Design an enzyme around this catalytic site. Structure first.
Site, short mmCIF file in Angstrom:
data_model
loop_
_atom_site.label_atom_id
_atom_site.label_comp_id
_atom_site.label_asym_id
_atom_site.label_seq_id
_atom_site.Cartn_x
_atom_site.Cartn_y
_atom_site.Cartn_z
N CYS A 63 0.92 -1.45 -0.30
CA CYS A 63 0.02 -0.03 0.00
C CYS A 63 0.61 1.26 -0.08
CB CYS A 63 -0.89 0.00 0.98
SG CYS A 63 -2.28 -1.23 1.10
N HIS A 100 -1.53 11.66 15.40
CA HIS A 100 -2.33 11.14 14.12
C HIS A 100 -1.02 9.87 13.55
CE1 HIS A 100 -3.88 10.40 10.19
NE2 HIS A 100 -2.84 10.92 9.63
N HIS A 103 -4.46 5.29 9.18
CA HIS A 103 -5.70 4.82 9.04
C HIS A 103 -5.77 3.37 9.29
CE1 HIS A 103 -5.73 8.80 7.44
NE2 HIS A 103 -7.01 8.88 7.68
N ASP A 107 -10.12 -4.36 5.14
CA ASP A 107 -9.79 -5.40 4.15
C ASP A 107 -8.13 -5.87 4.39
OD1 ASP A 107 -9.05 -3.23 3.14
OD2 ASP A 107 -9.40 -3.57 0.97
N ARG A 116 -6.10 -3.72 8.61
CA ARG A 116 -5.00 -3.22 8.02
C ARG A 116 -4.84 -2.11 8.72
NH1 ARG A 116 -5.89 -3.50 3.30
NH2 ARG A 116 -6.37 -1.33 2.72
N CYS A 118 -2.48 0.95 8.09
CA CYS A 118 -1.54 1.57 7.52
C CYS A 118 -1.07 3.04 8.19
CB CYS A 118 -2.20 1.97 5.83
SG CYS A 118 -2.19 0.57 4.71
#
Lengths: 145, 144, 144, 144
Positions: A63, A100, A103, A107, A116, A118
């Site tokens: 990703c 932060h 996300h 899936d 997941r 990321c």
């Protein structure tokens, strides 16, 4: 835990670390060294040193960002809805320092929990296994393998 | 010399150094250690290590920002019109890395040349006199 | 094609036209007059007047933004990976003026190809069918 | 007089007019037509149409923005201090719509009162004398 003041953060974090962790910037895909790092250790909040992710739960998702099945612990991250064109995404933030991180997506690999995470490498610092005792993270070595 | 890419700068400068030098921000009054620093040495561009100011030309203007009467060399800095706020002020940037440094005003003491360079500490790195030789600034020791 | 200078665009585009097309902003849900517009005509790039979408391909499922199933031509819009938010989406931009328009999603009407061009009304100017001839778009009326 | 919603302003004001009036941006010096305009008429707030300056009080200050010795009415503008390097400036904003207009300086002509209102043309709309009656500003023709 008390998050350093914003003024302190501007003087300690790089611009990239600050934009990502304080202003919810996203680092360029495939840009961070942690993207393709798979060495034993843990990933901690760059701001606070709070453990966030274990190398045991990291995988190459293709990703563009460090990708993890799960946080190192249930309480280490918090989740927050945001929207683009009224389409929901789930933002992930650190528990103690409210950085932060990235996300989380529904899936990810099913046999590891279906999620997941990321995460921006800019939000993280890698502590190698061989350095964890010295860095104060000895009690979390067991999560590495 | 070549200015590092913006990408490299974002990963090397603090937020504060980046905002000031790259985005022409202005640090908070009295906030930086160089505001109250008066030791012999030189101030170099935080980005490049280009010499910018001598301690010899630093004085306490009391305003809240490091203040100098002149750059260490005339060509060390470049001047730019800044039309912010419906006025014209002279912005000062470093020559090589083109960092925003501050502004120069014509309200310095006349006996020191009349110019007051109000410079962000964030844009600078102080090289103490004792460290100049090791750091490659030996030739400028005479500028003090 | 020569795109007007940024200075020109600041004085000719509205704030939202500019922010959307030049700074890849997204207008608020339901903010734009084109949201539920169903008059026949074309939508052109607000910057260049390049045709982008036909009313023929517009539809309304109560989305907060103009929605089309396809561009008016394959070559009038370009796709770009948008890696915001640690994911990959497909941004759509105009060919000639490289305006940000919006994004394309794979959740549109199955019978029209499956795509949903989710487009900022602020990125578009609507040319009513009746004005197309005078405006130089006569050749495209058949797409309406 | 009238302050439109932010949504209405985004869709009506140019990016320039918006950034100046809403975000206190400053237009480039010498860039606006009104800088060199000296025709009888009034200047009204671009947002609200609130009368702000008379051409009677307009003069060439050489600074690069429309310059006036006074607002057309005491109540039509409000003033706010700001600082850079702890140096004082005085922001001028319109009363009704609270548009950022520009700055006022104590360096205007003495016979006209010593003030210089240095105003972004972007924040204004010129209503020539001969259009003032039709435009609804007949009561203010005495100020021209």
């Amino acid at each position: 835990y008390k998050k350093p003041s914003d003024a302190e953060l501007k003087r300690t974090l790089t611009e990239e670390q600050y934009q990502v962790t304080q202003n919810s910037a996203t680092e360029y895909a495939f840009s961070h060294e942690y993207d393709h790092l798979f060495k034993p250790g843990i990933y901690v909040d760059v701001v606070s040193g709070e453990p966030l992710f274990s190398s045991a739960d990291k995988y190459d998702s293709g990703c563009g960002w460090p990708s993890f099945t799960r946080p190192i612990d249930a309480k280490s991250v918090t989740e927050h809805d945001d929207f683009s064109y009224n389409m929901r995404r789930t933002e992930v933030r650190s528990h103690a320092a409210d950085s932060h991180l990235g996300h989380v997506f529904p899936d990810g690999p099913r046999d590891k929990g279906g999620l997941r995470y990321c995460i921006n490498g800019a939000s993280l610092k890698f502590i190698p296994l061989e350095q964890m005792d010295a860095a104060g993270y000895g009690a979390l070595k067991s999560k590495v393998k």
